[PDB]
C-alpha cells in the first residue's frame, strides 16, 4: 500500500495491528509518512484551508503545523496554504545540448569514417 498513493488505508493498517504491538516499527512508519507528505505537500495544491491537508496526516492545530509550515513554505495565512509555483528558470537551454550534442556528433563521426 506504501507503493501506490494508498494513504488512509495505511492509517487503517494503523487501525489493525493484529500480530503483536509492532510499535517500534509503526513509529518509524509514522516518521516515513511525516517526511513523505511533508515532501509531497509541495505539489500543485492551489489553496487549501486549515482543515483538509491539516487532518489528512496527524496534526490539527499544535505548533507542529508551524514546524512544517515554517520548516517548508505553505505559510500560515488567512485559512490559507500558499501555492507558490515558479517552475520557469531551468528550461530553455540550447547550450548544454550544444555541448553534449556537439560531443555526440563527433562521436558519430568517429565510428563513421575512421577505421578501427
Amino acid at each position: 500500500y506504501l507503493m501506490e498513493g494508498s494513504y488512509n488505508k495505511v492509517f487503517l493498517a494503523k487501525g489493525n495491528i493484529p500480530a503483536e504491538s509492532y510499535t517500534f516499527f509503526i513509529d518509524i512508519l509514522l516518521d516515513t509518512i511525516r517526511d513523505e507528505i511533508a515532501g509531497c505537500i509541495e505539489k500543485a495544491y492551489e489553496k487549501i484551508l486549515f482543515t483538509e491537508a491539516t487532518r489528512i496526516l496527524f496534526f490539527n492545530t499544535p505548533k507542529k503545523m508551524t514546524d512544517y509550515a515554517k520548516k517548508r513554505g505553505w505559510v500560515l495565512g488567512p485559512n490559507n496554504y500558499y501555492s507558490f509555483a515558479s517552475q520557469q528558470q531551468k528550461p530553455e537551454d540550447t547550450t548544454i545540448p550544444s555541448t553534449e550534442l556537439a560531443k555526440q556528433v563527433i562521436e558519430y563521426a568517429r565510428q563513421l569514417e575512421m577505421i578501427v
Partner: protein
Amino acid sequence: IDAFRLINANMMVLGHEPRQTTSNLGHLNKPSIQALIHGLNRHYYSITINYRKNELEQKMLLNLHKKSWMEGLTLQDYSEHCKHNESVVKEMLELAKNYNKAVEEEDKMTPEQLAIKNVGKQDPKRHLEEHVDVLMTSNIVQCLAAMLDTVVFK
C-alpha cells in the same frame, strides 16, 4: 624531363661502346620505345636526375595552397540544405526500388554473367552507397557547424 646529350657518331663508326659504366646508377629507368625509335642510344644518352628540396619552400607551399578561410563557420544556404536533402532522397526512393529489383535475379546465371550483363543499365548498389555518403557528409558537417556558433557566439 628526360634530358639528354649527344654521343659521338665517330665512336659509333668505331663501333666502340661508350660511356664506360662504373656505377649501378645509369641503367635504372627504362627507356621509352619512341625514343628508341629516335636517336636514343645511337646519337646520345640518357641522364638520371632528382630534385633539390629544402625545408623552407616545402612548408611555404604546403601551408599556402588550399586554406579555407572561415568557410566551415557558415551555415550553407539554410533554406536549401534540407531542401537539397529532399532532392536526393526523392530519387533515392526509386533507386531503392531498383535495389528491390536487382537482388531478385540472384541464384541465377553465374554472376560473372551479372558482371558482363550490367554494362548498359545502372546498378542500384554503387549508385546507392554514393548517395548515402553524400547525404551523410552533407548533413553531419552542417549539423555540427550549426552548433559551434551557439556556444561561441554568446
